[PDB]
Amino acid sequence: GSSGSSGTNDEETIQQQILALSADKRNFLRDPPAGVQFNFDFDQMYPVALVMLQEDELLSKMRFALVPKLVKEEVFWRNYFYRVSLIKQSAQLTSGPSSG
Length: 100
Hints:
- By secondary structure, the chain is an all-alpha fold.
- It contains 5 helices and no strands.
- It comes from Homo sapiens.
């Protein structure tokens, strides 16, 4: 039984990347600049993050010891996602041909 072809977009990895973040603390502290228009709504992505915790013990066990240890539960959920959205978006952004 061999396996070479996949087909489905690069979504199987998107999750693998979002995991590497949990194993990092510099990300929780690091925050995006102003120029970048990242309209993030905590209260909105507040609960949705709870589901990512249970699944990812590292993301929880850490956040707890890294918050407010590091940043406010809110901010933490802000910087964290920020990087995430970039990973997921890429999947598409990198459609193929580059123009402009």
